[PDB]
Design an enzyme around this catalytic site. Sequence first.
Site, PDB file in Angstrom:
ATOM      1  N   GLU A  30       0.861  -1.211   0.000  1.00 33.58           N
ATOM      2  CA  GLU A  30       0.000   0.000   0.000  1.00 33.58           C
ATOM      3  C   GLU A  30       0.886   1.247   0.000  1.00 33.58           C
ATOM      4  OE1 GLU A  30      -2.351  -0.266   3.595  1.00 33.58           O
ATOM      5  OE2 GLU A  30      -0.700   0.512   4.818  1.00 33.58           O
ATOM      6  N   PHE A  33      -1.760   6.705  -1.782  1.00 30.69           N
ATOM      7  CA  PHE A  33      -2.851   6.844  -2.784  1.00 30.69           C
ATOM      8  C   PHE A  33      -3.532   5.495  -3.052  1.00 30.69           C
ATOM      9  CE2 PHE A  33       0.824   9.638  -3.876  1.00 30.69           C
ATOM     10  CZ  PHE A  33       0.333  10.787  -3.296  1.00 30.69           C
ATOM     11  N   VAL A  35      -4.016   0.863  -2.209  1.00 34.94           N
ATOM     12  CA  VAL A  35      -3.529  -0.519  -1.923  1.00 34.94           C
ATOM     13  C   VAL A  35      -3.280  -1.235  -3.253  1.00 34.94           C
ATOM     14  CG1 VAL A  35      -4.034  -2.684  -0.700  1.00 34.94           C
ATOM     15  CG2 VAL A  35      -4.928  -0.520   0.188  1.00 34.94           C
ATOM     16  N   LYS A  49      -3.817  -1.623  -8.691  1.00 36.41           N
ATOM     17  CA  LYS A  49      -3.791  -0.448  -7.784  1.00 36.41           C
ATOM     18  C   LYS A  49      -5.228   0.060  -7.659  1.00 36.41           C
ATOM     19  CE  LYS A  49      -1.745   3.359  -5.818  1.00 36.41           C
ATOM     20  NZ  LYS A  49      -0.922   3.338  -4.585  1.00 36.41           N
ATOM     21  N   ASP A 147       8.711  11.585  -6.663  1.00 35.70           N
ATOM     22  CA  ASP A 147       8.559  10.589  -5.564  1.00 35.70           C
ATOM     23  C   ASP A 147       9.476   9.389  -5.822  1.00 35.70           C
ATOM     24  OD1 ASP A 147       7.600   9.815  -3.054  1.00 35.70           O
ATOM     25  OD2 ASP A 147       5.630   9.156  -3.792  1.00 35.70           O
ATOM     26  N   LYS A 149      11.987   6.783  -4.698  1.00 38.90           N
ATOM     27  CA  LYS A 149      12.271   6.071  -3.426  1.00 38.90           C
ATOM     28  C   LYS A 149      12.255   4.564  -3.702  1.00 38.90           C
ATOM     29  CE  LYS A 149       7.388   6.468  -2.036  1.00 38.90           C
ATOM     30  NZ  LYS A 149       6.506   6.783  -0.890  1.00 38.90           N
ATOM     31  N   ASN A 152       9.107   2.800  -4.764  1.00 34.90           N
ATOM     32  CA  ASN A 152       8.689   3.108  -6.159  1.00 34.90           C
ATOM     33  C   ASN A 152       9.728   2.572  -7.154  1.00 34.90           C
ATOM     34  OD1 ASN A 152       6.413   4.267  -5.114  1.00 34.90           O
ATOM     35  ND2 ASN A 152       7.026   6.390  -5.511  1.00 34.90           N
TER      36      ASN A 152
HETATM   37  C1  LIG Z   1       4.003  -3.262  -3.698  1.00 32.52           C
HETATM   38  O1  LIG Z   1       3.734  -3.787  -4.997  1.00 32.52           O
HETATM   39  C2  LIG Z   1       4.092  -5.096  -5.189  1.00 32.52           C
HETATM   40  C3  LIG Z   1       4.505  -5.919  -4.140  1.00 32.52           C
HETATM   41  C4  LIG Z   1       4.861  -7.235  -4.414  1.00 32.52           C
HETATM   42  C5  LIG Z   1       4.814  -7.722  -5.713  1.00 32.52           C
HETATM   43  C6  LIG Z   1       4.403  -6.905  -6.759  1.00 32.52           C
HETATM   44  C7  LIG Z   1       4.022  -5.591  -6.491  1.00 32.52           C
HETATM   45  N1  LIG Z   1       3.670  -4.702  -7.425  1.00 32.52           N
HETATM   46  C8  LIG Z   1       3.578  -4.869  -8.753  1.00 32.52           C
HETATM   47  O2  LIG Z   1       3.707  -5.923  -9.381  1.00 32.52           O
HETATM   48  C9  LIG Z   1       3.373  -3.534  -9.466  1.00 32.52           C
HETATM   49  C10 LIG Z   1       3.649  -3.403 -10.823  1.00 32.52           C
HETATM   50  C11 LIG Z   1       3.505  -2.166 -11.443  1.00 32.52           C
HETATM   51  C12 LIG Z   1       3.099  -1.076 -10.686  1.00 32.52           C
HETATM   52  C13 LIG Z   1       2.853  -1.254  -9.323  1.00 32.52           C
HETATM   53  C14 LIG Z   1       2.404  -0.080  -8.469  1.00 32.52           C
HETATM   54  C15 LIG Z   1       3.036  -0.214  -7.087  1.00 32.52           C
HETATM   55  C16 LIG Z   1       0.882  -0.141  -8.385  1.00 32.52           C
HETATM   56  O3  LIG Z   1       2.821   1.144  -9.084  1.00 32.52           O
HETATM   57  N2  LIG Z   1       3.000  -2.461  -8.745  1.00 32.52           N
HETATM   58  C17 LIG Z   1       5.203  -8.990  -5.652  1.00 32.52           C
HETATM   59  N3  LIG Z   1       5.467  -9.226  -4.368  1.00 32.52           N
HETATM   60  C18 LIG Z   1       5.932 -10.524  -3.858  1.00 32.52           C
HETATM   61  C19 LIG Z   1       7.423 -10.421  -3.573  1.00 32.52           C
HETATM   62  S1  LIG Z   1       8.161 -11.991  -3.000  1.00 32.52           S
HETATM   63  C20 LIG Z   1       7.533 -13.366  -3.942  1.00 32.52           C
HETATM   64  O4  LIG Z   1       9.649 -11.892  -3.161  1.00 32.52           O
HETATM   65  O5  LIG Z   1       7.814 -12.164  -1.547  1.00 32.52           O
HETATM   66  N4  LIG Z   1       5.280  -8.236  -3.651  1.00 32.52           N
END
Ligand SMILES: COc1cc2c(cc1NC(=O)c1cccc(C(C)(C)O)n1)CN(CCS(C)(=O)=O)N2
EC number: 2.7.11.1
Length: 288
Positions: A30, A33, A35, A49, A147, A149, A152
Amino acid sequence: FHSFSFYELKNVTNNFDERPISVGGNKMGEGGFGVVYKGYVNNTTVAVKKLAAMVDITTEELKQQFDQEIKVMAKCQHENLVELLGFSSDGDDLCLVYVYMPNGSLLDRLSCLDGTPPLSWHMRCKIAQGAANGINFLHENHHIHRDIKSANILLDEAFTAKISDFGLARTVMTSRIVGTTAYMAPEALRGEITPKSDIYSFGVVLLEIITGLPAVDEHREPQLLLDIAAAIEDEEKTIEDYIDKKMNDADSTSVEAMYSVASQCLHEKKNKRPDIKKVQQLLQEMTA
Ligand SMILES: COc1cc2c(cc1NC(=O)c1cccc(C(C)(C)O)n1)CN(CCS(C)(=O)=O)N2
């Protein structure tokens, strides 16, 4: 790029299940903006998202960041940027759909969230070069991230760095001063909008990569990671003392070379900082 039924996204995320993947839910992370939910559409794993004001922003300001991200990213395909697959605005909440990044955020992997093995210095150097290449593409196309970081910076199946979150994407002055305070350049806190702020924020990311420490830790002395950098420059501390111990393949030369780039990025006067091209070159010479 498509428009998705709000109900398809609701359906394939088990009704936007806030429980972790560990428990068996769909919540992956999360931010300010909303989760991020794990979903399955078009025979593919995707990131959904679900946008919401989890912070003092208007619902019209939320809709602005939604339209802004679609405008900037709809037709974008760079090696080191996230890929947007589509959106939903036909139901209860605004949704953005992306290609799934199996290895999540640089923040999460640096902290070894969920028991993941620590990233090697080798993987870290490639991630730093990747992120910078991603930032260069934005700056070349006269875009400011606002932003930058570790949360991101996302990591694909080969741990390739992808920059994410372009809701705020844009010398210029603003009254709405938005960003993450632990990462923000001093002039960005005063409301300036310049790509030189992105460089400063990247400096903090390089520190995270070298040390494995979060930018802010309320239980830590000092609480802000950029104060550890100041203390090193004032010789009250040393980089060797703060190099992440969760690596076996880190040599002092390449570590101090990366710290050098970070230190130049974190010049408090924006005009003393290197541009992204100069950051790319120095990070190249680091692995040569
Ligand atoms: C926080 O977002 C994620 C967290 C996690 C994973 C994916 C995402 N996020 C996206 O895949 C994604 C793609 C494009 C854009 C975005 C946004 C953020 C919405 O900008 N997020 C996978 N994962 C498991 C990791 S493990 C198997 O090593 O434990 N945790």
